[PDB]
Amino acid sequence: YYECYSDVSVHEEMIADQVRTEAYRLGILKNWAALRGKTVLDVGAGTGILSIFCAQAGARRVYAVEASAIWQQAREVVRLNGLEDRVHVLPGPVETVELPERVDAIVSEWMGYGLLHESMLSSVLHARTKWLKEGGLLLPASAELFVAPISDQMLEWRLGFWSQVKQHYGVDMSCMESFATRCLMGHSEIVVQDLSGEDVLARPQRFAQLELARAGLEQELEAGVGGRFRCSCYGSAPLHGFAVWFQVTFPGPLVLSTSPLHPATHWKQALLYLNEPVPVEQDTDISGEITLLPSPDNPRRLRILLRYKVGDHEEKTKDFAM
Amino acid sequence: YSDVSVHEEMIADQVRTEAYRLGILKNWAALRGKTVLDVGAGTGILSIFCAQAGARRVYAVEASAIWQQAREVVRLNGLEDRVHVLPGPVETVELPERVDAIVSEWMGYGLLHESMLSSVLHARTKWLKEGGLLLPASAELFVAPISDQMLEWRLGFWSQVKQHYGVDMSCMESFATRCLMGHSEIVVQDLSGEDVLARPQRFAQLELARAGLEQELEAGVGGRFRCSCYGSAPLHGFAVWFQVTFPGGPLVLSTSPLHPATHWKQALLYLNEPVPVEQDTDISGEITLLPSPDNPRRLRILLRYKVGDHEEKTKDFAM
Numbered sequence: 187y188y189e190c191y192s193d194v195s196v197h198e199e200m201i202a203d204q205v206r207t208e209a210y211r212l213g214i215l216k217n218w219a220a221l222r223g224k225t226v227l228d229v230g231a232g233t234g235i236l237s238i239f240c241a242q243a244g245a246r247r248v249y250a251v252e253a254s255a256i257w258q259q260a261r262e263v264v265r266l267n268g269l270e271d272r273v274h275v276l277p278g279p280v281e282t283v284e285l286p287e288r289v290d291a292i293v294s295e296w297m298g299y300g301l302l303h304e305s306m307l308s309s310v311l312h313a314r315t316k317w318l319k320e321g322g323l324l325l326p327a328s329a330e331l332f333v334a335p336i337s338d339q340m341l342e343w344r345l346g347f348w349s350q351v352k353q354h355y356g357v358d359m360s361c362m363e364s365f366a367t368r369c370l371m372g373h374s375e376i377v378v379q380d381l382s383g384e385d386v387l388a389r390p391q392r393f394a395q396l397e398l399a400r401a402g403l404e405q406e407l408e409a410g411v412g413g414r415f416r417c418s419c420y421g422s423a424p425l426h427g428f429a430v431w432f433q434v435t436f437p438g439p440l441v442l443s444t445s446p447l448h449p450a451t452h453w454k455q456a457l458l459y460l461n462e463p464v465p466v467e468q469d470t471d472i473s474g475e476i477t478l479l480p481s482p483d484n485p486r487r488l489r490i491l492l493r494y495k496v497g498d499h500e501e502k503t504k505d506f507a508m
Numbered sequence: 509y510s511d512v513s514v515h516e517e518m519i520a521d522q523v524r525t526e527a528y529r530l531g532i533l534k535n536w537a538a539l540r541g542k543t544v545l546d547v548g549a550g551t552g553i554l555s556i557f558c559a560q561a562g563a564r565r566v567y568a569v570e571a572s573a574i575w576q577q578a579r580e581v582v583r584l585n586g587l588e589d590r591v592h593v594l595p596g597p598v599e600t601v602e603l604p605e606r607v608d609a610i611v612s613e614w615m616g617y618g619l620l621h622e623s624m625l626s627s628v629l630h631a632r633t634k635w636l637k638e639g640g641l642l643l644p645a646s647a648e649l650f651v652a653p654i655s656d657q658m659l660e661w662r663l664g665f666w667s668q669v670k671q672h673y674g675v676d677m678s679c680m681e682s683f684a685t686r687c688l689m690g691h692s693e694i695v696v697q698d699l700s701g702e703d704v705l706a707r708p709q710r711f712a713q714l715e716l717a718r719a720g721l722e723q724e725l726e727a728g729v730g731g732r733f734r735c736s737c738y739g740s741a742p743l744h745g746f747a748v749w750f751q752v753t754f755p756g757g758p759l760v761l762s763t764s765p766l767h768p769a770t771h772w773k774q775a776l777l778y779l780n781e782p783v784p785v786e787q788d789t790d791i792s793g794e795i796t797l798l799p800s801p802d803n804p805r806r807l808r809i810l811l812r813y814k815v816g817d818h819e820e821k822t823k824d825f826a827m
């Protein structure tokens with residue numbers, strides 16, 4: 187983990203994510219009145235680009251706390267922009283860092299795949315408890331989870347591939363389709379893949395909301411985060427499972443979304459495949475509940491417990507891990 | 509290989525699958541009425557190509573659980589009379605006769621990574637008749653110095669941050685070069701002809717009919733090379749790729765960046781830093797493909813090179 191964020195690739199991926207980086211830039215600059223002349227704490231600053239956005243927004247003092255080796259690159263970026271007097275890159279975890287003062291605001295890019303995989307939300311909440319002033323600002327302030335049933339067209343392509351071999355090469359391989367379905371759908375993994383609007387089978391349902399200012403959100407991460415949903419299918423298509431994505435809200439309201447209906451990001455969406463495709467029709471009712479949990483082996487690994495019911499079928503469950 | 513994705517990836521590789529189909533079908537005269545051994549048949553698609561080419565019998569040996577799907581595929585094509593799927597490794601399988609030909613899809617990344625060449629050589633010694641047909645029959649290894657254009661854009665990205673967000677990050681290019689080039693790992697990436705700095709050089713050839721080739725793989729495979737640069741560009745390292753040659757009745761399946769792309773792409777051997785070169789800059793050296801000391805299935809590459817008047821350097825790559 188320390189080895190990943192000390193490398194260039196993940197930071198190159200995060201900054202080249204134009205939708206994400208421009209959203210944080212605007213969400214910060216939009217809060218100029220709340221940041222002008224104030225102090226900011228950046229949890230997991232990486233290269234320090236968000237700390238510099240806060241200084242450009244008028245912040246008097248920004249502390250860029252970064253645990254991996256990339257803090258030495260953040261120091262170089264900050265001096266390269268002539269900002270080391272206002273932006274102080276501090277190495278180490280935010281839980282053991284020593285600030286000279288409680289800060290007026292906390293900014294952090296903490297979200298992982300499925301919102302909570304390999305996430306540093308607990309590190310941000312730990313910094314909110316220890317260093318945020320009473321009534322301080324949080325950027326982003328909240329995260330919203332969404333779910334929708336899907337008919338993954340790419341999966342349908344990989345499933346029908348074996349029925350298409352004979353047209354191209356003359357060898358009938360349609361008997362592979364039953365075997366390919368079990369291999370691509372029978373597993374219990376969370377699949378990270380980006381879908382389009384054509385894949386969405388019903389109206390996306392918002393099933394959970396996390397307000398980062400709430401005390402006790404820390405304990406609820408251990409118990410599990412999620413909620414219940416109900417939707418009606420747009421039309422007839424094979425139900426492959428569900429897509430789970432998130433958005434974060436900045437106090438303005440600016441929204442950074444990872445929805446398939448909105449421009450793509452590096453998070454894509456988290457796909458929960460059923461064991462087999464399920465035929466559904468227009469106005470088919472799909473209800474259930476989804477819980478985002480830490481894996482019992484690794485508290486940084488996202489586990490998702492799915493409970494669902496399709497029409498008159500009996501309620502089923504499935505247990506996913508990243 | 510009991511999972512579908514690797515077989516789906518192999519068959520979706522149109523350049524690879526069509527080359528094997530033609531190397532088999534164009535050998536109809538040599539395969540008509542003859543027997544074929546398919547080493548690692550997987551789904552059995554190559555064994556059915558050999559049947560259409562005219563083979564009187566094909567033994568499709570497969571060691572993973574995918575042999576049950578190949579058993580179904582052969583039945584679905586009405587060919588279980590002359591195509592027989594036999595489970596287990598080719599080293600312990602019992603055939604009723606020696607065969608006239610061997611067909612096998614055995615090449616891995618860098619030709620010899622997660623390859624089954626030894627199993628094919630084991631089957632050549634045990635089951636192939638004298639002078640029998642091998643499909644493919646040989647493999648040719650190539651090297652060319654490269655200026656990776658994708659690597660240069662990944663390096664130049666940090667100087668472009670100030671234009672969009674107003675934060676200068678050009679100090680990262682020095683740090684990104686060490687991280688993307690200072691490692692000692694074989695990078696599997698596909699290049700184009702624009703990346704090639706000099707005329708590709710063949711530095712080794714493997715003849716699959718040769719007994720004792722298996723012992724030579726364990727000592728190392730490769731040879732020397734010499735090339736002069738096309739023009740001026742930063743030298744980032746060397747790309748290694750292969751081609752397999754079928755006996756004609758001569759079709760070649762290439763993984764060169766100058767030829768249509770395959771799933772093997774090319775094996776990129778990056779230097780620690782970029783090296784400026786110009787037109788007619790002579791690059792000489794030697795490359796050896798070896799089994800890793802930790803894992804004999806894992807490809808290691810010893811690179812020894814000299815750029816112009818610079819001192820001869822070496823670098824030790826693994827997959």
Ligand SMILES: NC(=[NH2+])NCC[C@H]1O[C@@H](n2cnc3c(N)ncnc32)[C@H](O)[C@@H]1O
Nearest residue numbers: 191230253254279280295296297298309
């Ligand atoms: N946004 C994400 N999904 N991940 C961002 C992780 C970034 O925050 C850094 N980071 C993670 N946890 C911490 C922590 N407790 N304290 C400081 N930096 C941290 C990590 O080094 C990397 O730069």
Ligand SMILES: NC(=[NH2+])NCC[C@H]1O[C@@H](n2cnc3c(N)ncnc32)[C@H](O)[C@@H]1O
Nearest residue numbers: 509548550571572597598614615624627
């Ligand atoms: N990896 C490749 N270059 N080709 C695919 C390997 C295929 O050959 C099969 N295979 C590999 N080694 C052997 C062996 N010794 N005997 C039989 N089948 C084998 C493997 O199960 C898979 O279906």
